[PDB]
Structure formats: structure tokens, C-alpha cells
Amino acid sequence: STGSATTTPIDSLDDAYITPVQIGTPAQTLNLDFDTGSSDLWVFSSETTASEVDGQTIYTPSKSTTAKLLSGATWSISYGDGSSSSGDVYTDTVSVGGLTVTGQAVESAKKVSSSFTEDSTIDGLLGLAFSTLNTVSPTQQKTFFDNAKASLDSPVFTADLGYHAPGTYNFGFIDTTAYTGSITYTAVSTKQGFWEWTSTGYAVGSGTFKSTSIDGIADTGTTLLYLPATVVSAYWAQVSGAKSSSSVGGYVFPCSATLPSFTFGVGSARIVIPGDYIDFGPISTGSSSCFGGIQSSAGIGINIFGDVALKAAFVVFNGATTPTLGFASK
């Protein structure tokens, strides 16, 4: 079996993407952030503290005839940005894009932190990293991807995210019309539970490619591209009005600059981010300074290939017994 679903950026900056998911019988459709950096599917629900819900769509397990309480299990998760949520667990039927799994754990939020309540467009998260990072206790639960692989035509999903435009998640097949030239695959380490891999180097604009290993994770759930401090300084040293601003938290530049491209290596292949993708947008509406899409990961302690890098590629998450990651230009 396969499935295919459109994913849309939540705002005109592409700060994140949502994809509809149908939970329950009869279906309730919730718009989830698919996050290849964590492994929990949780949603806002009829159990979540009322005062912690600003316009999101909730799941009500008591209206689903296939939901069942997973007795004794609870979960609690915090993310790299500080935000957090906990709750208890039902299993229910969940379909994306046509592809149905029965018996998928749907973590029901009793509490969510203030970042979640304040964003009305995301009704919860569907995790697609490996199932070792799931927070359910005492027995961890598998992601939707792992429960699906028995039935999928092939054990893969692709992410094809758009720049200020919608894109696709596909499960189970690779669409050969979505990309140009051929996919290059590079090895995944799962030792810390992420789609973690090693890029072979970088180049800024039309200058030289420097071969240097940058170990990073492919994370659909992080908006920006976070790289080591000295690669990031080498890129903004080509943009004449760019500086590091302590006030705003990163490199900012004049919104009028044409930014150069940034190339990253995948084995012997090279993926080119166009400089307009790196112009994140202005620091405030009207302002003449904009915030850059490439920042230093020194503060996070791992390099993150997030949606600024990923949406310049068609990306295959190969979840065979030895996983790999595949990238093609598009």
C-alpha cells in the first residue's frame, strides 16, 4: 500500500509545515507537524486543560469507535526549543494520505506548554525518527512509519517540502517525476535515534567546495539550517551588510541584499540552496533588516539540516533494516 498527502507551510515564512491526518472512526482530521527529529504522535484532545487550548482542533477519543485506552501508559516530551507536553495514550486507527494503520499509539495531551497553545495552526506532532526516542512508558510505542512498513510497497517515505508553497509527503514509493538527475544515498547512524548522517563539505556561492565532515540530523521539525560556527561565519562574510546581533539571536542582514547560494555535499553529489531560501524574512514587519536562514549550531550542540536545507531537495528516508538517506535536486 501507499499514501500521499499535501503539506503546507503554516505562515508566509515557512516556519513549519502541516499535513492533515485522519484519526479515529469516524475520521477526525487534525493538521499535524510531521517531525523527523522525534518519535511521538501526540495531539491536542478533549483531555487537554481547557485554558491551554487557543483555536486548535482536538481529538475526542470518546467519539471514535476504534479507540482504546492503553492502560497504565503515560508520556512526557520536551523539545530542543524548550516546549513540552504530557498525557496518556490510546491506540486508534490513523490514516495519512490514504495509508491506514490500525493500532497506532495516539498520545493524548493532558497539558501543553505556552508555545503550543499560542499557535493555532498545529494540532499536534507526528514523529518520524526512530522508535527508540519515543517517550511512552513503561513500553515505548512505534512511530506511524514503523507500524506501516509491513504493508508499504517499499519501506520508504519522501519529503518534498516547498519554498513558500505546498509540497508532499509520500509513503511507500518514490515519485520519479518529483526530482531531477538521480538520488544519492548516504549512510544513517541510528545511535542517538535520529536520521543522522555526515555531509562531505560545503561551498559558499560560486567559490570552492571544502571537504570537511559535518555530522548533522535531517529534521523536518526545525525551521532553519544550523551549522558549525566557522562554516556559518564563512558564509555571512560574503554578505557585506551581515552581522551577528545579540538582540535578535543570530546573523541578520539587509533585506535588500541578494544572498549567495550555499552548497552542501552528499557523498560526491552537491545540493545547492538558493540564496532566496536563506533570506528567512524580516525581523519585524516593515523593518529593513531580515533574519538569516543559516545560523550557528554551537548553542544546540548538534548540526541540524532543517527545512531551509531540506526544501531545496527531494529527500528519501529509507527505513530498510540498514537505513539510509537519499537526496536529489529538484
Ligand X SMILES: CC[C@H](C)CNC(=O)[C@H](CC(C)C)C[C@H](O)[C@H](CC1CCCCC1)NC(=O)[C@H](Cc1c[nH]c[nH+]1)NC(=O)C(Cc1cccc2ccccc12)Cc1cccc2ccccc12
Per CB under 6 A, residues contacting ligand X are: 15-16, 33, 35, 37-38, 77, 79-81, 83, 115, 119, 125, 133, 135, 217, 219, 221-224, 300, 302, 304
Q: 201, 9, 204: which is closest to 121 by C-alpha?
A: 9
In angstroms, give the least distance from the CB of 181 to ligand X: 28
Report phi then psi at 166, rounded to 5. -80, 170
The residue of the chain with the least Cβ separation from ligand X equals 37
- 220 vs 324, beta carbon nearer ligand X: 220
Report phi then psi at 71, rounded to 5. -50, 125
Residue appearing with cell numbers 514509493: 173
In angstroms, give the least distance from the CB of 183 to ligand X: 23
Residues belonging to the active site:
35, 199
In angstroms, give the least distance from the CB of 179 to ligand X: 24
Residue appearing with cell numbers 526530482: 179
- 171 vs 226, beta carbon nearer ligand X: 226
- CA gap 92, 101 in Å, rounded: 9
- 77 vs 328, beta carbon nearer ligand X: 77
In angstroms, give the least distance from the CB of 36 to ligand X: 7
- 156 vs 304, beta carbon nearer ligand X: 304
Burial of residue 66, with CB atoms counted within 10 A of its CB: 0-12 exposed, 13-18 middle, 19 or more buried: middle
- 217 vs 325, beta carbon nearer ligand X: 217
Q: Work out whether strand 28-35 and strand 41-43 pair parallel, antiparallel, or are unpaired.
A: unpaired
The answer to whether 204 and 212 are in contact (CB under 8 A) is: no
In angstroms, give the least distance from the CB of 97 to ligand X: 20
- 3 vs 306, beta carbon nearer ligand X: 306
In angstroms, give the least distance from the CB of 203 to ligand X: 24
In angstroms, give the least distance from the CB of 302 to ligand X: 5
The answer to whether 156 and 316 are in contact (CB under 8 A) is: yes
Q: What is the 3-state secondary structure (H, E, C) of 45-79?
A: ECCCCHHHCCCCCCECHHHCCCCEEEEEEEEEEEC
CB-based contacts of 137-145 (< 8 A; 24+ apart in sequence): 137/73, 137/74, 137/75, 138/72, 138/73, 139/73, 141/70, 141/73, 141/89, 141/91, 141/105, 141/107, 142/105, 143/39, 143/41, 144/41, 144/94, 144/96, 144/101, 144/104, 145/171, 145/317, 145/319
- 133 vs 271, beta carbon nearer ligand X: 133
